[PDB]
Amino acid sequence: ATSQDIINSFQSIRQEMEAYTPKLTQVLSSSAASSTITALSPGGALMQGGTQQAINQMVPNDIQSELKHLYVAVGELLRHFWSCFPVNTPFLEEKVVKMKSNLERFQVTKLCPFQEKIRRQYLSTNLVSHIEEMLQTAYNKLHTWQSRRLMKKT
């Protein structure tokens, strides 16, 4: 990996562990144990007990039905897009562009009002973020494929 500094560190640790003596007090301290118990106590960093505590009751079912409809629409559109992929014929080139335009129109029409509604109601769940991840991934894949197509023409 590195230069002879790795051998230097190996020699240093060998010398340090040549004269090794077990310790009793130095193993732990009261402050360290208290901090660890606080971390391991319920509601701590490792023991976060919320984990969408009332997600069944939060973001009420009226939003949930709209969220399911948006999920179904996004799934159908992405299924069409990925069925078009890979683009091996010039005919599918325009179909993918139309699919991207439809995706953008659907996003602007639905998600942006959905984002505004979430912001107004201040939902703690990032429902929009996951949907954006799929759309962002699709956009990145399309851009990469277009760049590769440009590379083949150079």
Added chain:
Amino acid sequence: RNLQEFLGGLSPGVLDRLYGHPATCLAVFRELPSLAKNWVMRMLFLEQPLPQAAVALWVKKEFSKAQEESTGLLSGLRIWHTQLLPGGLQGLILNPIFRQNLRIALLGGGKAWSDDTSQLGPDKHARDVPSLDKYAEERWEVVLHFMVGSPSAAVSQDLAQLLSQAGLMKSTEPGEPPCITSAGFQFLLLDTPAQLWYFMLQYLQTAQSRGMDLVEILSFLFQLSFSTLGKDYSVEGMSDSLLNFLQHLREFGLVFQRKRKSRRYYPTRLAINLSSGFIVVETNYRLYAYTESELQIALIALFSEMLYRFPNMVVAQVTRESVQQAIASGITAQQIIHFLRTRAHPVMLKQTPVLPPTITDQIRLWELERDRLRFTEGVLYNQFLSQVDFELLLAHARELGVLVFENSAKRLMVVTPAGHSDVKRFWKRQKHSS
């Protein structure tokens, strides 16, 4: 009775003094439940108390009963104490002395439990582990034979008095040898580690008569429990009172010592087990024991019929008559089953359960035969002219706690002979008052 039962009944000062020895703390810790040990280990490095709710939330709701039992046992043993945490809350923190001694016993620190061993060098008359085991077995067999009363067993008068104090044997007439009681038979049927612990508990209870410190004896016993087999220790460093206890243990076979004035003592296998197979059982009610000593032969013949005695084998048959005779002698079926399970041959350990269910069920059914009929002496009242009169007398008898049987349909009641006079006086007064 176990160690926890004895420790619970001790005063807080005695418990605090016991924790001053690192060996005692470890022995108490190993007797805790599995859940309690984890709590003790978690709180080992804590200098501040924790809320009771925080401790309670560690265990799930379904297992709250075990958590409550463990907390109650810890409170009874006074391992930790509730602390008045500021803000109205109750804080739980381990006893500082117990925690320090436990850390010393685990991490290290201070001096060794024993003074030294190489000061006198190697032992001139050192023995071997098989020799120590043989000596311990011979001493235990001698003690148990003296319980029976055979002339081949000769022990000290103090041991005989202690056995009499334990209730195992009674001396109706002075001079004549004592006779073993039914409790003696039950104790004989008990397992050897159980027998040792019961004897030690009796000794601790009666130690106040001899003016011996309970704390020192308990600490020394716990130190002996963790001692390494085959390694001797220095007698010096103990009070003269502890010397008598050590001599008594040597008489009991727990600890080997060549001479009373010797500075060395070798703990035996029995001493190590104080902290806490040869019988083959067949479905045809036959016991095959791989033993030669007369002690096991007598123990088996107590509740079975002997058939053959090969030089290294005993073939006996468990019959209904023999079990009935043994039960009439005072031994319960549960003790017999436990004894058979404890002495079970290693081959039988493969079977699940080790003892065949049919044999245990048959033994239990044979036990119930003797007590099929229930006998309760008393006086019967059946001359009630009115239903209301019967109810008042029945209520009065129940208040006196002398009622044995009642039948409201036929207005029949049975009272104890002791309470008959009181009920008769009450009935006479009621008629006079009417």
